[PDB]
């Protein structure tokens, strides 16, 4: 469970960065 939660956390951190990039580009 801890490893799966860590990876979801990782994904969401990355999603924040990606979405901020997309906001700039739009």
Binding site residues, Zn ion, CB under 5 A: 12, 15, 20-21
Nearest distance, CB of residue 20 and Zn ion, angstroms: 5
Nearest distance, CB of residue 4 and Zn ion, angstroms: 11
State residue 20 phi and psi, 5-degree precision.
Answer: -60, -45
Return the structure tokens found at 9.
């956390």
Nearest distance, CB of residue 26 and Zn ion, angstroms: 13
Q: How many other C-beta atoms lie within 10 A of the C-beta of residue 21?
A: 10
Return the structure tokens found at 3.
């490893």
DSSP 8-state secondary structure symbol assigned to residue 11: H
Give contact residues for its own copies (rule: CB under 8 A).
Answer: 1-2, 4-9, 11-13, 15-16, 18-23, 25-26
């Amino acid at each position: 469970i801890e490893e799966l939660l860590r990876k979801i956390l990782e994904d969401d951190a990355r999603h924040v960065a990606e979405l901020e990039d997309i906001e700039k580009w739009l």
